[PDB]
Amino acid sequence: KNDDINREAHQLNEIRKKYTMRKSTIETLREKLDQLKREARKDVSQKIKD
Amino acid sequence: DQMRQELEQLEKANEKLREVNNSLVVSLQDVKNEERDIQHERESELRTI
Amino acid sequence: SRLKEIDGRLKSTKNEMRKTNFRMTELKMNVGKVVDTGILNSKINERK
Amino acid sequence: EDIDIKRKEIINKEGEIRDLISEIDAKANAINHEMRSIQRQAESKTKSLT
After folding, report:
1. Of C5, D17, C9, which Cα lies nearest the Cα of B21?
2. Using a CB-CB distance cutoff of 8 angstroms, which residues of chain A are in contact with residue C46?
3. Which of A32, B11, D7, D14 could hold C21 in an S-S bridge, CB 3.0 to 4.6 Å?
4. What are phi and psi of C37, to 5 degrees?
5. Which chain A residues are Cβ-neighbours of C28 within 8 angstroms?
6. Distance between CA B7 and CA A7 in Å, rounded?
């Protein structure tokens, strides 16, 4: 029974790990948006110059 | 996956080895009973002779 | 000699059961591990 | 640290498991000796009385 309680605690810890990895995913989202904005400004500048 | 399957077959094999070990213990105590009665008969033969 | 043989196979059964114990220790070792499928699921949703 | 806690718990638990298996095997041997003794002495008493 103590082992089962420990397993429940580690499942909660894995949920917390999933939350931290969610924050990692939003960081990936921010860097993706950064790259998209950079390429967008570059291509629109190229199109305007052409 | 393989490891859940292994634990299932291991529970099966653990039960099986439990029954065979119980049978082994019964056989061993029967064998030692045979030994004690054989040695008692030998002692009786020795005392008679 | 028969008793010695049955004791030896008892030793074999005890080794087998202790290996099963190691394997269940491994079982809950791998129960308590981090899973990194969140990026996979989010990326699948993005693709969809 | 909690992982190590559950590891020590499981090594202990398997320790009591194997110790209890040995103890119950010993008590099975003892009860077999008791039943053979009681049946032998019961047979002797039946021979004496009957």
Report:
1. C9
2. none
3. D14
4. -90, -5
5. 3, 7
6. 18
